[PDB]
Amino acid sequence: DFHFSAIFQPTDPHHHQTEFAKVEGSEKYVEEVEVFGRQALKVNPEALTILAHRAFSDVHHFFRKDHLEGWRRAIEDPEASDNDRYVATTLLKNACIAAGRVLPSCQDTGTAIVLGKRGELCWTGGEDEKYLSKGIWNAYRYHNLRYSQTAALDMFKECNTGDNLPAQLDLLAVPGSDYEFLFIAKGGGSANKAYLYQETKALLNPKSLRAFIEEKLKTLGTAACPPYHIALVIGGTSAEMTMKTVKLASCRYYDSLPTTGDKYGRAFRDPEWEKIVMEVAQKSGIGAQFGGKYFAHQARVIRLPRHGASCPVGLAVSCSADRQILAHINKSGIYIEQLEQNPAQYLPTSVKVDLKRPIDKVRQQLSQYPVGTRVMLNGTLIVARDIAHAKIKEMMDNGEPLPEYMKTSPIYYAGPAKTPEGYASGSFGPTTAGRMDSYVDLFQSHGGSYITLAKGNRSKQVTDACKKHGGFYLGSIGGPAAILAKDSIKQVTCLAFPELGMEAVWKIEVEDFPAFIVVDDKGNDMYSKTLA
Amino acid sequence: NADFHFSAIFQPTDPHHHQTEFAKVEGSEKYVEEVEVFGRQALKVNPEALTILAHRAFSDVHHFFRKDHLEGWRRAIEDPEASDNDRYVATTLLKNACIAAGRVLPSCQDTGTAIVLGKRGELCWTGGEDEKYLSKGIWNAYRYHNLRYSQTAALDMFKECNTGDNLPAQLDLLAVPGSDYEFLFIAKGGGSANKAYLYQETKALLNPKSLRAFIEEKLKTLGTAACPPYHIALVIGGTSAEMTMKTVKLASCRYYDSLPTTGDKYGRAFRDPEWEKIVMEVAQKSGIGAQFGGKYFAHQARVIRLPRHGASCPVGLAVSCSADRQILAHINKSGIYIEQLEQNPAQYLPDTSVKVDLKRPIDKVRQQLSQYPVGTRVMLNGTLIVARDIAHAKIKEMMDNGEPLPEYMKTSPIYYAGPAKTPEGYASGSFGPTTAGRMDSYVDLFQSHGGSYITLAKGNRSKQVTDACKKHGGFYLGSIGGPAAILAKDSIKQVTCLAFPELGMEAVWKIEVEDFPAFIVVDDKGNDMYSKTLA
Ligand code: SF4
Ligand code: SF4
Structure with missing residues (x-):
């Protein structure tokens, strides 16, 4: 009678759709072993320092294809406004300067966020947070980035930490013997545009939901440098779970979720309502910052289960500094997502x-x-x-x-x-x-x-x-x-x-x-x- | 490369919650075995232990309360400054806890969303199916006890049905050092969950005048909809909205009570007792009372100050309600330990x-x-x-x-x-x-x-x-x-x-x-x- 059903069931849980590059000679940091009949991975914790350093270096100079494709789409679309085209050309030109690996794409080099999934049989020594932070520390100290973290000495007296620490280190326990990661360099401006709404069943009908979306998208405004990757989460087991999902959705981390629900309450992407979000975004006229069609690159809509009395809703964007990078460590070494290193090909x-x-x-x-x-x-x-x-x-x-x-x-x-x-x-x-x-x-x-x-x-x-x-x-x-x-x-x-x-x-x-x-x-x- | 200094954001002085009283599940040492691999101590844990633990946690938590919750109801009865309605509501809730302590009727009809915070040590080996085994124990608790199935599945965006078993649970299993398995179980009511609020604020809030006016304004928006007296938690700052909201939830469970009370140049979190007193004063002077006018809008307050990006100031506001339901637990070389709740609530009635x-x-x-x-x-x-x-x-x-x-x-x-x-x-x-x-x-x-x-x-x-x-x-x-x-x-x-x-x-x-x-x-x-x- 009992049936376990995980809330999130991606068809691509290991992100095989992503291209990775192996860090050269990194197999010297790992070793496959067999303990008590099970395959396990010994990981020198220095590997986490190496990986985090390279991740938070590359991510400030290169972008994913879907981000760059969006900028070219805004330039080539006959329906784009002149201001749409001007902004997208400026941003694409900016990405070409950033690919020189000297100047970061944005002055706000962001908060360092690590989502880590350590397998039960992946053994690092357990000091993952220290070793990850040192790699982050290396990236921000020795590259032309910015120290953006503000420490509270008391409730109101503040100082800059001078090194962009502390990081947000969310290390999860999962099956297996690998170590999987999503690194995010999250700008403060786009972070401020993560919104939580406490709604009710009265929202859950086509007329009300569309009106809700029209109303909330305008409250994003142009403050987080659109074109936006817009993420919207309907439901959730708690506010923080809703807000974590909309963050991950905005990073396209949940793109391989199923597109239908079931009686067990599994999460699903809703492509029909992604289309409606995009329709609202274009018909809004807000445009790529100064009026037009390109308020949004693309949309992700994820429907979550909910307590009968609850309907948390999450709204978040990824900004022009669209900065995330997938990575994993396995028996072969350190693999890090390959970003687009020639953005100039996307300029018409x-x-x-x-x-x-x-x-x-x-x-x-x-x-x-x-x-x-x-x-x-x-x-x-x-x-x-x-x-x-x-x-x-x-x-x-x-x-x-x-x-x-x-x-x-x-x-x-x-x-x-x-x-x-x-x-x-x-x-x-x-x-x-x-x-x-x-x-x-x-x-x-x-x-x-x-x-x-x-x-x-x-x-x-x-x-x-x-x-x-x-x-x-x-x-x-x-x-x-x-x-x-x-x-x-x-x-x-x-x-x-x-x-x-x-x-x-x-x-x-x-x-x-x-x-x-x-x-x-x-x-x-x-x-x-x-x-x- | 020696200017670097790692500082964990959260530095509780009691990370294993030694201040909490625990009870050992009898004979539960048969589910664990200590081994040595590569010179390191590790603990083999039969996953049946997580079914046993989750079942016990999500049964006991619906019939008993913590002392600090029960003391608050007694304070509302005995305080001369309490209103008559304050005293009436608190006596009713205490009488209600006495009925719930009979282990037949749950304290609240909304037996909540099952939330598990688990911290699995690097060398704690369960077989890896923790979610399934935890969910089976949660499933046992709600199927075989007089609880309620509160979870709503979305068949599409708008088509919904009850899952019929109070699953899915929210399972947050973290990877941490060591070889033990530590837990916080929460049976979170829907009404109090709805009163978890996120505000995107600015540096212009961060002064005594603005912050006090903000607290006065926001506390009123909690109203009486989540059955006060409240455990009020307020988190100022955070590295992200989801981190702020996770922290304010945990603060409301008093999970962060042993945090330091001062910040430092590395941005560590701290509890602020001065502003906790201010929240209590705003709550008491509000006149909202324990649901129907008076002084006891709140049991107590937790205020945690977090580091922030210079351009950001997320703020979280959340409560724990009259159905204040959380239980700590851990698994170690000695077996399964579960927090001891108060089994004689009647001693708190005058x-x-x-x-x-x-x-x-x-x-x-x-x-x-x-x-x-x-x-x-x-x-x-x-x-x-x-x-x-x-x-x-x-x-x-x-x-x-x-x-x-x-x-x-x-x-x-x-x-x-x-x-x-x-x-x-x-x-x-x-x-x-x-x-x-x-x-x-x-x-x-x-x-x-x-x-x-x-x-x-x-x-x-x-x-x-x-x-x-x-x-x-x-x-x-x-x-x-x-x-x-x-x-x-x-x-x-x-x-x-x-x-x-x-x-x-x-x-x-x-x-x-x-x-x-x-x-x-x-x-x-x-x-x-x-x-x-x-x-
Ligand atoms: S919103 Fe993004 S692109 Fe705009 S300034 Fe903040 S980090 Fe840079
Ligand atoms: S707010 Fe708490 S006490 Fe009130 S109905 Fe909901 S779960 Fe029960």
């Missing part, structure tokens, strides 16, 4: 803005154009993001003035990766503007931050502030951190708060920096029609 | 109502209820029609296809509930209320067709229900949430399946009750018992 109206003027002259010029105008910035930018804004607001709350460097130049929300030797700058693309939304009106009423430069749609309070104070929000393309570093950024200098690491205040000299006018000084928002 | 006859026309019951303000405690005697999520959806679907609202929705108040299995020789199994909010979208519709004028469930409801009851002369009665066993033993005299038997526990039932306690939460006049504390 502007207003010059002189910033080397008083900020009021720059504001006047910007006032002459409507939202949606593409501009090219030439001059000095002051760079500040989350913590700097918080420190500055605190200074003003204690009677101190708004710093002079918040009034001379447009404010670029960004945090750079490390500078390669002999380079003007490391990868240096924008960060999400919405996170600074609560400082705009305050700073503008005190005579600064009249012009901001970042990526993503912003809230109505920012539109109101720019109209009230004669301000502007310029949207940079999100994602192309390397080509911006290589072509646009000529000089980088730390201005204030050097203890903050990448979150210090910087002053940079730029040339031909592309941006769109998203919010003008008149109440207009380039996203007001597609993200209403 | 040493004005309107009678409503339901055996009348529903319009006369509405008239009587109209005489009283919200907050009036009533005592129900008569027939209830029982229907929840799927039945309500099926009935609305029928009306959308031109069929009338069924007559059995108009004759009697509607009790939102789904019973556990009936013990032999009992009138009914555990049979407490379901969260009312989930049916909010049907009330106005059903009332416009002459039914669902009186509903009986637990939890605060949305404004549309208040409007509907005012427009249609309706009432919402809040039962005490949680005391499913004492309701079954003392109040429910007859249970009969009326319609949709294929839905299992979600069928439409007709039950006869006596002395069923409830509060008037929404009257027919626009008044809501929760309008001041949950505004």
Whole structure:
């Protein structure tokens, strides 16, 4: 009467559909043995250091075919908007710079996430987390990446860990004698777009579910650098199980799941509703960041079993920095997923803005154009993001003035990766503007931050502030951190708060920096029609 | 390459939970054998041990509680600052635990989703079929005890059926050092699981003024729908949304109680007792109380601060409910050990109502209820029609296809509930209320067709229900949430399946009750018992 049925039953559990390359001479780190009648694998734990180092190096310079195919699709589709094509060409060009293995594809080299599946008869000595972390530590310390992890000394006092540790190390116990891995370099921006909804049976009908999807996709906006790999999970045995599934779905880790359910509650991919998600994404008009058709590369929809009283729902994306890498260790050595090393094969109206003027002259010029105008910035930018804004607001709350460097130049929300030797700058693309939304009106009423430069749609309070104070929000393309570093950024200098690491205040000299006018000084928002 | 220093995110001082009392399963040392391979100590474990362990865990956990849960109910009774309703609810739950301690009726009708957190040592060898053997033990517990099958299978996106055995379970088996097998078993109720919330916040939250205002705002959204007093867990930060939500779940089980209380430059997690005190103050000063106004919104609080990506600040909020059900266990060279729960809950008990006859026309019951303000405690005697999520959806679907609202929705108040299995020789199994909010979208519709004028469930409801009851002369009665066993033993005299038997526990039932306690939460006049504390 009892029948065991696993929730997840992929037809390709070992990811044979993926191409792997064996690390040279890595068979010296493994040995096949037979203990108590069973085949087992002795693994030198140094193999985990080697594997994690190479994984978190390669993943910042190369992409999977399905990601690159999406960018070419946006360029070649006659139905794509001009802005769709412009963004996809920029991102593909950026991937070509990153393939040089010097500049990472994004300044946000992400949180290191390891999903490991150690077989019952795979023996490493048991110090897997330490040895994996050292390999991650090696990748971020000795390559031109970024230290993005923020340690809490108490509830509110924070510091950068200086090495991109700690990693998220999810090590699972599974049958057999191999060691299987999924490594993810997960950007903070795309991580912030992982959403959990507590729903009910009233959602579970075609009309309600479609309306739900139309409503929730808009809340993703453009803040996580679309085109998106959109993942949606309906159901789950718990919120954390739902959120883990939607993360893995976004990495296309569950692509070989069955496509039908059964009376035992197994998970399944729903291709009909993936098609509906894609239809909503295209008809939304949100586009590849600035209006059009290519809001999404592709969609994954996974239906999960549920408690009768529960319906958790997960929504997540993978961003332009689509960075995951499969790997395994077996009796033959260390195998790591082979990424596309020649992205160039996938490649088939502007207003010059002189910033080397008083900020009021720059504001006047910007006032002459409507939202949606593409501009090219030439001059000095002051760079500040989350913590700097918080420190500055605190200074003003204690009677101190708004710093002079918040009034001379447009404010670029960004945090750079490390500078390669002999380079003007490391990868240096924008960060999400919405996170600074609560400082705009305050700073503008005190005579600064009249012009901001970042990526993503912003809230109505920012539109109101720019109209009230004669301000502007310029949207940079999100994602192309390397080509911006290589072509646009000529000089980088730390201005204030050097203890903050990448979150210090910087002053940079730029040339031909592309941006769109998203919010003008008149109440207009380039996203007001597609993200209403 | 020596600047490197590994720091585990979680560094409990009591990783093996030595502070917890364990009992050895008698003769269970016959399932393990110590061996030596390549100079290293390893433990051979017969997988039958995982069936035995999971079966025992998911049986005991439905009849007994931990001391810190029971002490909270006693605190609510003995605190001079506790409201009268606080004391009434806590006494009811304690009396309910005494019935559950009889090992026949489970403490709650929602015997939950079976969740296993397992940590298998590298040299702990089970044969590798841990999931199957664990699931068989879970299957044994729910099949052979008076529990409930609560799991819903999706045949397609929208076609659903009950799995009939409370499987699948959630099985999270981790690879860890050593040769032992350590476990946390959780029987997680659906209602409290629904009150696990994820917020995507920013650095602008990370100051005392913003964080306190955030906690005040978010705690109210928990409401009374997950049967408080709550164990409230709050996690600030995390390396990912799923890691944040996993942590807040574990915090609510007090699994992270021995974490350090200070951070360091390496980003380790820590418990923050100062902000735990702040959560308790917000909870107590909220006036929400133990379901019906007062001080005891929360038993206790856990606040864990996590590291974060500079651009990120995920926040998790979750509760453990009155059916606070978790059990620790481990397997080692000595056998199977399982956490010892409190078997005499009665030692925690220390040493004005309107009678409503339901055996009348529903319009006369509405008239009587109209005489009283919200907050009036009533005592129900008569027939209830029982229907929840799927039945309500099926009935609305029928009306959308031109069929009338069924007559059995108009004759009697509607009790939102789904019973556990009936013990032999009992009138009914555990049979407490379901969260009312989930049916909010049907009330106005059903009332416009002459039914669902009186509903009986637990939890605060949305404004549309208040409007509907005012427009249609309706009432919402809040039962005490949680005391499913004492309701079954003392109040429910007859249970009969009326319609949709294929839905299992979600069928439409007709039950006869006596002395069923409830509060008037929404009257027919626009008044809501929760309008001041949950505004
Ligand atoms: S591509 Fe955009 S969303 Fe992704 S890591 Fe880079 S900046 Fe954050
Ligand atoms: S006590 Fe309340 S919230 Fe907890 S499982 Fe029972 S009905 Fe659900």
